[PDB]
Every structure is written in structure tokens, then in C-alpha cells.
């Protein structure tokens, strides 16, 4: 499903708290981890409306941990509104307790259609905004430029105002560079995290000739 | 019953200063955004400024940027709109409002009038 | 003041249905689902009638409904009544520096 | 219990016209004098005009005589203040009031602002 | 606006008593007993405190009282409070063309 | 006592209605006449409860009943409902008045006539501090009827008569009335006359 989105969020905050995020301001997924099990009861309260139970799903992870999650009903994904979350163990013990706003946990979907081309003496990058995300004008991006043999991330370029094009300049000849792009809400009215990295695209720069 | 009451309006000379107040009661005040919307006499609605529940972040419309200052008190349940360096085009009826679902304005106050010179 | 596009006036006999359009750009109405409609009687404060494009607050009659296609929202009153004669504004999120861009306003007149 | 509400105020160009209304409720309206009192911004109070219970006689202050016209509706319980040939010196907050014992003004309205150029 | 003679300012600590004079001519104050006093808080409308020189409306505390001698009326608040810090106007009948001639106004300040 | 004020008012409107008047805007006396019988005077001040008034009687030439309202109920610019009910239970009179709308001043005094033309001087009604708001009227008669009736305005206490015939005994008198339109009422009784032979 959205394994890449949950993996990015887990790498940001860790497995010791209730991780919640939205992709298109009309959804909400909350998940956490447990050592491997046990049973839990997810419940939320929207404003002053009576409490609601949420259906919980379970799944093992590569780490050997067990991941629980809940997908909120679309009717309860209103923004700019207090949403109180609670995870209670089957023993009755309180586990997690949060009060969030949907607009403050935005994690967009990863950018797609990344393409690398030569300038003729630079490298031009083009990509597409997150699928089914109409706020393209209010999305800022970030491009990664990395290499092999422990070089790591050589360049990190910020792209603003919903532009989907980038021109790289300081690249060494006879070098295979790997590019990836992440997305974020530009408008300060939203809170959240960077999207998962896009599917990488590599390109081999020519030696000087 | 939800109640919002504005006060502090009146005539102000161009370049002067004025402070508007909004007494709020009827809901959990410290968990919602609060906003100001003005309306020139015989004209439409214009969004002025809003503030986060904890009042950590403030946002303004471009025409009032650097001139107005919105604030709140989550103990007295009050919203303030400091109006410095007033212009003639700031002449309008200022409502304080509660931001609800989808960035909508669920509850509005009666509104207070601010008149400045021409218009 | 920059605003959204609304027809200046609209009319309709009791029982009929009137649709008020609201056209914006792809950066506000066509970008977010934060579309709201308001009703304002003369001398009174605006009243929320529609939030989130189509959803409707408690107290607002079933006669009122909203929709969205492209960059244009539409308010529809199916059962016209005398108490519906007022001004109608549309709003939409258009950024942090403009949390709610209203329209020019539409004066709905209930005919005989 | 007594409630007075003014409306119709706003900006008016010099020489223009503006009509103020005053909605009255809470007492036998058709039995009392009704008056208008304005207050210039930062200044004191000034009596403008008053009208008899039956509205048969009207009286005005010298500075507004022949320019303003006070009237009343003992059915709608309303008091009106017609302002013709408006001057700059008319810029003030206009209150409508109920005249009671000893020519005093017992009940006042919220007041409406009328601004004219200067 | 031609007005009556009133002291421009007055101050006093809580518990003290303050007397505000109001001087007119022999055609108003001293001709009629139609002397009235008013209280006005900032942003609010004037409130009747004293009518017919000394008589007092229901709701107004006995701490406020008025008198008249010659062509000068006087309002007196004996037990000063923080809620009394406001403007105070005097009025009097001076003809049909002057049904109520007010004073210049007095800003009463409670110094605490 | 106030005999001349009651005679002037009776001569103006008659005995077929409840006659009420005030002299100094701090009093109020209502009276009427009958060709005996008993009556009950009652009044209502604003929303305050009804109050009966003590009635007094006196012969005339007819019987005159009257009531002097308490000073506490003589407020002006305020609706005062009056009712006179017969002892038989039959309704007689019913009026709604304002105190300021029934002003009948006391007769002017100290009238003195001298020759210059003929100059008339008098004094305003006793214990009446609205002297600046009192207008007067001068009567000039002969032995012929009333030859001249002159209006005096703006609180003036002097009058100069012209075009008077020589060797004629003229009689002068002055009455008073409220000048300001905010007040309604009647003329005062005529002053004590002063004669002069040109």
C-alpha cells in the first residue's frame, strides 16, 4: 500500500509514539509498533461529538516488530479542527494520547516521472507532482544528488513555487550520479513531514571531451 | 450557546492606532483558530488576519501586513486586532470569527465599525 | 480587493431552484476542498451555510446544497422561501496570506 | 427592558442626504417625546432635535434648522432623522433617546456614526 | 456647539467624594428645575443618573446626588468607585430651540 | 386663593370638561363644576399604580370640586392619565395630560401707567423664574370696549402705547403666558387695572 510513506515517517519520529499522517487532506492513517504482540483499541473524538472506535489492522515488519494502524472515515477528516486520538490496551492501560489537526500532519505522496537529461554542459531534471494532488502551486520540492563510494549526498537543492524543473551544474565528469526528489507543503498553514523519496534515476556524466 | 462580541471600534484619524477586542464564550476557545473579516459599507467580505489556537503563528492579508497585529488570550477567551498606521481603505465593519471545519467560519460576532477618512 | 467571480444578482419564485456559481483559479477552489458559502441578511453578520464544498452545519435546511467542478463551486437552493432573500458569498482557502478569499457577492431576490 | 437601535449611518458627501432610523421597543412608544443627540468625536454632547408623542410638533437646534427633519411612526415604533444638505460640522455619533420626566433622557440607543469629509 | 460651563477635569481616590459644578444662565438653570446629569463610559452611550435636579432613576445608587442653587447645578458622588471613572454631562431646558443644553463635559478619574 | 386663575380658565373652556392647570411647573390642580352629588378623582402616573386624590368642595353662584396633586407626581413631559368617576359609578371625565402642556401663570402685578404717548410698566408673575420666557398682552379700553390689544414679546416688561385720543379715560391691563412652544396652556388672569386721563 503506502509502505514508503509510513517508512519515511517512522524514520523521522521513531516507533515510540503514535504516528499519524494525511496525503490529500481527506484521509488519515495512524500507526505504531509493538515488540514481538497484545491487543489494542483505537478510539478518537472529533470536537465535542461522541467518541468513535476505529477498526484496527495488524501486520509483521522486517524488524520483527508488529505494526498496528487505523484508517479514519473520510467524514471525520476535517481540517483546522481539534481531533483527539487515543490508543488503549486490552488490559485497559493507556498507551497513546494525541490531539491533532489534520492539516498539521500532511505527508504528501512521493513525486513521480523523474527524468534526467543533459544540457549541452549540465544536467536537467524534470519530474511530476504527487498523483491526485491538486495543490501543485503550493508544493515545494527538494532534489538529492548523490554518488557512489561513500560520497553520499553531494547536493541538496530546494525548489519552490510548485516548479517541477531543476538544473544541476557542479557535476564531475565520468561519474554516475543518482537523483531523487521529495515533496512538501509550501504554505505555513500546513504542518507535517517530507514525502518519501521518489524512485531514483541515475545518469552517467561524460568525461571532458 | 456560542457568543462572540466585538468592541473598541470608532472613528480613527489616518495613521493613528486602534485596538479591537472580541469576548468569546460558548466553546473550547483555546483549541480553535480565530480570524478577523472586515466588510466595507456596501461592499463584500475581506479576510484580514487569523491566529493559531496556541497563538504561536499569525497570518495577515498583504494590504495590512506590517500594520496590523493579531493576538489572543486563552485565559480570558479574548481575541485582539491591533490596528497601527490606519489607512482610509481600512474603513469597514470588523467581525471576529471562529474557524471551523475546512477553514470555514462557523460562528460570527455582531461586528464593530471602524471609520477612517475617505474609504 | 481581489475576489472570486460571482454573478451580481439572482432571482427566483417560491418553490423554484436557483444556482449561484463561484469561479476561481487552480490555486484556490480547484486546489483545495476548503470551499465555504455564507448567508448575510442586511445589517446582520454572515452565517455559515455550507462548509467543505458540500457539507452543511446543523441548523441549515436540507434545501441548501453545494458542489464543485474544476475551479467553480455552486450553491443550490431547491425550496425557495421569503426568508432566503439575502446576500450570498463563497469562500476558499488560497494560501496562508489569504486564508479565505471571498467572492464579490450575490444578491438573491425572492420574487412573487 | 427598554431597547433602542439606530441604523443607517455611514459616509456622506458634503451636500448629500442620509436618513437615520431608530427601532424602539420596551414601553408605550406613542406616549413619550423622542429626541436625537449627536456627539462629535472627542467632543461633548449636543441636542439636535426632538418630536412630540403624536408627532404634531417638531423642534430643532439652530445649527440644523431647515436642513434636518425629524419624524416618527407610532405604529412601527420608529424614530427617523432625515439629513438634507449635510455639512462638515455634522460629523458625529447620533443617538436616539426617550424623553422622560423633567425633560431628561432616560433611555439611549447604541448610537450610529455619521462622517462627513472633515 | 454652545454649551454650559463645566469643569474640564476631576480626580479622587476611592472612598472620597467629588462634586462637579454646572453653571448656566438665568434662562435655564435657575429658571427651570429641568436639570439632568449623565454618565458616559468610553465607547458607550450616555446613561441618565440624575433627573429633576435631585431625583434619581431606578438602578442608580444613592451615592449619586444632585442639587441646585442660583444658576449652578452640582452632581456629587460620595462613595467613589473604580466603575465611576467616566465622563459626566449636565443638561438643562433652555427653550424649544434648545430642549437640552449640555455642558462641556467632565472626565472623572479614579486615581486608586 | 387661586380664585382668579380658576375664573380665567373657566371663562375660556367652560364647565363641561375637567379643567387642569399649573402655575410654576411644580404643582397641579384639577377642578370641575356641577349645577349636588359626590365624585371620585383618580390618576395614573406612567406605569405606577393608580392613586386616588382627596376632593374638596365649595359653592359658586353651582358646586366646584377640586384636587391638588402631590408635588411628587407633577413631573413634566410625561403621560398623566386622569379620571373623574361619579359616586353612582358612572364615568364623568377622562383625560391624558402633560403638566408642561397646561401652564396657567399667575397674573402680572405692579402695573403703573404714566405719560411721556403713554408708557406702561409692570412686573412679571410672582415667584416665576421663567421671566425671560414669558410673553405678555396689553389691553386698552374706554367707556367703546377694548380699543387696543398689544402683544409684548421676549420677556419685556415695558410697553409704549400710541394713537390714543385726548381727554379720554383709558384702562390698562396685562396678562401673561408661556412663550416657548414646548409649553402649552392658557393666558393668566388680567392684572389689576390702571386708569389714566389724557
Going along chain C from its start, the domains and CATH numbers come out as 1-112 (2.60.40.10)
Residues A173 and A205 in one domain: yes
In a domain, residue F49? The reply is yes
Distance from CA of B56 to the nearest CA of E (A): 31
Distance from CA of B23 to the nearest CA of D (A): 18
Residues F188 and F108 in one domain: yes
In a domain, residue F3? The reply is no
What CATH architecture is B1-119? Answer: Sandwich (2.60)
Question: Which DSSP string corresponds to B98-117?
Answer: EE-GGG-EEEE---EEEE-S
After what residue numbers is chain F broken, C–N > 2.5 angstroms?
Answer: 35, 61, 116, 143
Subunit contact E1:D63, Cβ cutoff 8 A: yes
Domain boundary among A105, A127, A161: A105
Experimental approach taken: X-ray
Comparing CA positions, the residue from B52, B80, D105 lying closest to residue E40 is D105
In chain A, the number of structural domains is 2
Residues of B in contact with C54 (CB under 8 A): none
Buried b / exposed e over C95-107, threshold 16 CB at 10 Å, is: bbebbbbbbbbbe
Subunit contact B31:A188, Cβ cutoff 8 A: no
CA atoms of D88 and D96, how far apart (whole Å): 21
- CATH code: domain of residue F172: 2.60.40.10
CATH of segment(s) D1-118: 2.60.40.10
Q: Confirm if F7 and F106 have CB atoms less than 8 A apart.
A: no
Beta bridge partners of A97: A86
Residues A116 and A195 in one domain: yes
Residues F83 and F140 in one domain: no
Report phi then psi at C97, rounded to 5.
-80, 0
Q: C97 by DSSP, 3-state: which? A: helix
Residues F59 and F125 in one domain: no
Q: What is the extent of the structural domain holding F69?
A: 16-102
Residues A149 and A78 in one domain: no
In a domain, residue F7? The reply is no
Q: Confirm if B17 and B114 have CB atoms less than 8 A apart.
A: no
Buried b / exposed e over A85-121, threshold 16 CB at 10 Å, is: bbbeeeeeeebbebebbbbbbbbbbbbeebebeeeee
Residues A55 and A126 in one domain: no
Residues F112 and F183 in one domain: yes
Q: Confirm if F147 and F118 have CB atoms less than 8 A apart.
A: no
In a domain, residue A1? The reply is no
CA atoms of D90 and B20, how far apart (whole Å): 26
In a domain, residue F4? The reply is no
Of E30, E32, E95, which has the smallest distance from its Cβ to F25's Cβ? E32
Chain centre to alpha carbon of residue C11:
15
Final resolution, Å: 2.8
Instruction: List all chains that touch chain F, counting a touch as 3 or more CB pairs closer than 8 Å.
Output: D, E
Of B11, B118, B119, which has the smallest distance from its Cβ to D113's Cβ? B11
- C-alpha separations of A141 from A108, A126, A162, A179, A181 in Å: 11, 12, 8, 13, 7
Domain boundary among F102, F125, F159: F102
CA geometry: angle B4, D91, E91, nearest 5 deg: 90
Distance from CA of E30 to the nearest CA of F (A): 7
Residues of A in contact with C26 (CB under 8 A): 134, 137
Subunit contact A80:B59, Cβ cutoff 8 A: no
Q: A92 by DSSP, 3-state: which? A: coil
Helices first, then strands: H and E counts in chain B: 0, 11
Report phi then psi at A184, rounded to 5.
-155, 155
Q: Confirm if F139 and F173 have CB atoms less than 8 A apart.
A: yes
CA atoms of D105 and B70, how far apart (whole Å): 39
- C-alpha separations of D87 from D41, D47, D68, D118, E102 in Å: 15, 17, 11, 9, 22
CB pairs under 8 A between E and F: 25
Residues A36 and A125 in one domain: no
Residues A78 and A97 in one domain: yes
CA atoms of E94 and D102, how far apart (whole Å): 13
Q: Identify each DSSP E strand in A36-82 by its residue range.
A: 40-46, 52-54, 57-60, 66-71
Report phi then psi at D14, rounded to 5.
-55, 125
CA atoms of A121 and A115, how far apart (whole Å): 17
Buried b / exposed e over B74-97, threshold 16 CB at 10 Å, is: eeebbbbbebeebbeebbbbbbbb
Q: Which ranges constitute the DSSP H helices of chain F?
A: 3-13
In a domain, residue F157? The reply is yes
Interface test with B, best of C32, C48, C73 (most B CBs within 10 A): C48
CA atoms of D79 and D82, how far apart (whole Å): 10
Chain centre to alpha carbon of residue F78:
21
Residues A189 and A111 in one domain: yes
Residue A66: CB atoms within 10 A of its CB come to: 16
Closest chain F residue to E99 measured between Cα atoms? F182
- C-alpha separations of A136 from A99, A160, B10, C30, E1 in Å: 28, 11, 43, 10, 63
Structure letter (DSSP) for residue A192: B
CA atoms of A42 and A88, how far apart (whole Å): 7
Domain positions in chain D are 1-118
Q: C112 by DSSP, 3-state: which? A: coil
Subunit contact B102:C45, Cβ cutoff 8 A: no
- The kind and range of the H/E element at A11 are helix A3-13
CA geometry: angle C42, C85, B3, nearest 5 deg: 50
Residues of E in contact with D50 (CB under 8 A): 99
Question: Which DSSP string corresponds to D68-81?
Answer: EEEEEETTTTEEEE
Residues of B in contact with D115 (CB under 8 A): 11, 115
In a domain, residue F6? The reply is no
Domain boundary among F102, F131, F163: F102
In a domain, residue F2? The reply is no
Amino acid at each position: 500500500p503506502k509502505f514508503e510513506s509510513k517508512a519515511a515517517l517512522l524514520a523521522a519520529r521513531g516507533p515510540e509514539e503514535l504516528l499519524c499522517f494525511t496525503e490529500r487532506l481527506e484521509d488519515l492513517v495512524c500507526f505504531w509498533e509493538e515488540a514481538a504482540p497484545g491487543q489494542y483499541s483505537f478510539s478518537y473524538q472529533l470536537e465535542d461529538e461522541p467518541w468513535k472506535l476505529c477498526r484496527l489492522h495488524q501486520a509483521p515488519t522486517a524488524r520483527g516488530a508488529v505494526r498496528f494502524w487505523c484508517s479514519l472515515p473520510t467524514a471525520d477528516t476535517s481540517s483546522f479542527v481539534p481531533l483527539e486520538l487515543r490508543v488503549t490496551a486490552a488490559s485497559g492501560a493507556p498507551r497513546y494520547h494525541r490531539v491533532i489537526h489534520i492539516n498539521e500532519v500532511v505527508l504528501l505522496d512521493a513525486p513521480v516521472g523523474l527524468v534526467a537529461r543533459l544540457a549541452d554542459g549540465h544536467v536537467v531534471l524534470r519530474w511530476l507532482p504527487p498523483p491526485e494532488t491538486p495543490m501543485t502551486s503550493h508544493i515545494r520540492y527538494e532534489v538529492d544528488v548523490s554518488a557512489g563510494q561513500g560520497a553520499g549526498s553531494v547536493q541538496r537543492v530546494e525548489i519552490l513555487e510548485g516548479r517541477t524543473e531543476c538544473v544541476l551544474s557542479n557535476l564531475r565528469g565520468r561519474t554516475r550520479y543518482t537523483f531523487a526528489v521529495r515533496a512538501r507543503m509550501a504554505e505555513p498553514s500546513f504542518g507535517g513531514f517530507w514525502s518519501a523519496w521518489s524512485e531514483p534515476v541515475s545518469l552517467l556524466t561524460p568525461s571532458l571531451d | 450557546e456560542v457568543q462572540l462580541v466585538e468592541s473598541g471600534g470608532g472613528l480613527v484619524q489616518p495613521g493613528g492606532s486602534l485596538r479591537l477586542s472580541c469576548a468569546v464564550s460558548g466553546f473550547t476557545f483555546s483549541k480553535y483558530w480565530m480570524t478577523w473579516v472586515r466588510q466595507a459599507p456596501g461592499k463584500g467580505l475581506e479576510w484580514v488576519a487569523n491566529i493559531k489556537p496556541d497563538g504561536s503563528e499569525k497570518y495577515y492579508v498583504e494590504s495590512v501586513k506590517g500594520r496590523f497585529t493579531i493576538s489572543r488570550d486563552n485565559a480570558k477567551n479574548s481575541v485582539y486586532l491591533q490596528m497601527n498606521s490606519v489607512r482610509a481603505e481600512d474603513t469597514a465593519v470588523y467581525y471576529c470569527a471562529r474557524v471551523s471545519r475546512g477553514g470555514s467560519f462557523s460562528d460570527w460576532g455582531q461586528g464593530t465599525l471602524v471609520t477612517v477618512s475617505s474609504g | 480587493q481581489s475576489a472570486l467571480t460571482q454573478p451580481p444578482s439572482a432571482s427566483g419564485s417560491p418553490g423554484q431552484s436557483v444556482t449561484i456559481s463561484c469561479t476561481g483559479t487552480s490555486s484556490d477552489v480547484g486546489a483545495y476542498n476548503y470551499v465555504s458559502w455564507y448567508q448575510q441578511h442586511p445589517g446582520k453578520a454572515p452565517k455559515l451555510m455550507i462548509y467543505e464544498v458540500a457539507r452543511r452545519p446543523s441548523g441549515v435546511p436540507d434545501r441548501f446544497s453545494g458542489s464543485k467542478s474544476g475551479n467553480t463551486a455552486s450553491l443550490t437552493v431547491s425550496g425557495l422561501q421569503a426568508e432566503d432573500e439575502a446576500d450570498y458569498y463563497c469562500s476558499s482557502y488560497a494560501g496562508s496570506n489569504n486564508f479565505a478569499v471571498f467572492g464579490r457577492g450575490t444578491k438573491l431576490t425572492v420574487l412573487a
